[PDB]
Each structure stands twice: as structure tokens, then as C-alpha cells.
Ligand binder design. Structure first.
Ligand code: NAG
Lengths: 49, 48
């Protein structure tokens, strides 16, 4: 049922080994736990902002 | 609360034999847990 990949540097585009990573995620069955960075800026004082 | 699990803790000394003492104290929050699973009952754990 299994055949072995054989990769050599002589291979052209498409025949080369292409490492693939997929980031599958689950939607809102719980409080949010994983996400991106919320950017923060410098602090200011003595002026309404 | 809506999947969020909240535990409030308070450390305090006491000198009494068996029952709950009389007095006033408040429990500050310790940590909130974003678990998101349902609970129907609970059970305590001991040291053998
Ligand atoms: C826990 O069980 C209740 C019972 O109906 C269900 O409504 C609820 O969605 C369950 N919690 C989760 C996170 O699936």
C-alpha cells in the first residue's frame, strides 16, 4: 500500500520534495485561545486622546 | 461562565477546632481558565 518517495537534486520543478504545512483550525466551540498579536503603541499623558 | 472557568482563592490563618469561624473576609480572584467544556458534577482528590 505504500511507495517510497525518491528525491535527488537532479529533479526539476514539481519532482522536487515540497514540504507542506497546513494550519487547520476550529470555529468558536469555546473561548478563543489562539490568535495573532494585538499591536501596542507608546504611552502619552496630559492630553485627551 | 460561558466556557470560562474562574477560581477565587483566599489564604488566611485560623485557630478553631472543627467548624467555620465567624468573621468577614473576601476572596480575591486567582486565575481564569478558558476551558470551554460542560460540567455536570465534580469530585475531590486527596493525598494517600
Ligand atoms: C455540554 O452538554 C450540554 C447538554 O445539552 C450541551 O448543550 C453543551 O453544548 C455541551 N457543551 C459543549 C462544550 O459541547
Amino acid at each position: 500500500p505504500l511507495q517510497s518517495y525518491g528525491f535527488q537534486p537532479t529533479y526539476g520543478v514539481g519532482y522536487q520534495p515540497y514540504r507542506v504545512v497546513v494550519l487547520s483550525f476550529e470555529l468558536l466551540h469555546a473561548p478563543a485561545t489562539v490568535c495573532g498579536p494585538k499591536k501596542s503603541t507608546n504611552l502619552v499623558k496630559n492630553k485627551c486622546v | 461562565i460561558d466556557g470560562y472557568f474562574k477560581i477565587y482563592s483566599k489564604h488566611t490563618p485560623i485557630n478553631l477546632v472543627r467548624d467555620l469561624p465567624q468573621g468577614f473576609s473576601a476572596l480575591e480572584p486567582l486565575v481564569d481558565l478558558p476551558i470551554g467544556i460542560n460540567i455536570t458534577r465534580f469530585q475531590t482528590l486527596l493525598a494517600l
